[PDB]
Design a protein around this ligand. Structure first.
Ligand SMILES: COc1ccc2c(c1)C1=NN(C(=O)CO)[C@H](c3ccc(OC(F)(F)F)c(F)c3)[C@@H]1CC2
Length: 272
């Protein structure tokens, strides 16, 4: 039963650097300090959808795990709706991959394992992210990650809010399963997230994103990320996982608990 916060609780007289965070920005809280601000709606009122929203939030508040970012609270105000979540100092996954330094096999692989525990946890709670991608992986100072849903994809009501025409406030297709490409009617499954996971493993070892009509149809046909562009050393059973998880058949792809069952043994020994 979620924490409500107010707009007044924050300060703008501060120059925060929300660089490398994405759509969401950084906010300074007067009592508690640095936080992540997702503004989702601004404009006219509509206290007619408030209750539903709350219920949704209540439901999503049941998701609590070390690899999913925490909601610190919501701002539900007249003509203004926001989500407020924990601060992750290093920002999203791409930003850290596209850093000016470098990151070890042991780190990258631990990042992967952490992701996996996240996703397995989520599916454990019978929930489909529907939008897994490096943008929605956030990193703390100790390169421990947390999964986010910053485009509200896995939401229903809050989703419906972030698009209400009366609002005043896509590449994401490169991570989408092909089943869902040009077919909006097929119900997403855990597997859709697994395809997405695959393309993320690619993004990680490639330290960069992947690459419409032609391309979309190509991916539907069987096109995948150019596995040649990984100039970094990437293990055989890992490019094997990548290959297996972006299979055109949802039947062919593995569950996260299975993936981990086979990967947890493989991280600790040959990676950490
Ligand atoms: C509004 O009530 C709520 C109540 C609880 C939460 C949120 C919003 C959140 N919102 N979040 C966002 O990233 C929103 O941009 C975070 C979040 C959302 C979904 C996640 O997994 C998904 F989407 F199921 F696939 C996740 F790992 C983290 C955060 C979770 C906790």
């Amino acid at each position: 039963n979620v924490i409500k916060m107010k707009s007044s609780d924050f300060l703008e007289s501060a120059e925060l650097d929300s660089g490398g965070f994405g759509k969401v920005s950084l906010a300074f809280h007067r009592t508690q300090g640095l936080m992540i601000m997702k503004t989702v709606y601004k404009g006219p009122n509509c206290i007619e959808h408030n209750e539903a929203l709350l219920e949704e939030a209540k439901m999503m508040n049941r998701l609590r795990h070390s690899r999913v970012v925490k909601l610190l609270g919501v701002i539900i105000e007249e003509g203004k709706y926001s989500l407020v979540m924990e601060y992750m100092e290093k920002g999203n996954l791409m930003h850290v991959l596209k850093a000016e330094m470098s990151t070890p096999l042991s780190v990258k692989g631990r990042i992967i394992l952490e992701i996996i525990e996240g996703m397995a946890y989520l599916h454990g709670k019978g929930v489909i992210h529907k939008d897994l991608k490096p943008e929605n992986i956030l990193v703390d100072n100790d390169f421990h990650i947390k999964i986010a849903d910053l485009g509200l994809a896995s939401f229903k009501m809050w989703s419906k809010l972030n698009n209400e025409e009366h609002n005043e406030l896509g590449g994401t297709l490169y991570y989408m399963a092909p089943e869902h490409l040009n077919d909006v009617n097929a119900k997403p499954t855990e597997k859709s997230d697994v395809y997405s996971f695959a393309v993320v493993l690619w993004a990680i070892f490639a330290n960069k994103e992947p690459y419409e009509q032609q391309l979309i149809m190509a991916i539907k046909s069987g096109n995948r990320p150019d596995v040649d562009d990984i100039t970094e050393y990437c293990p055989r059973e890992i490019i094997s996982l990548m290959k297996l998880c972006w299979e055109a058949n949802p039947e062919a792809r593995p569950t996260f608990p299975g993936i981990e069952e086979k990967f947890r043994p493989f991280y600790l020994s040959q990676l950490e």
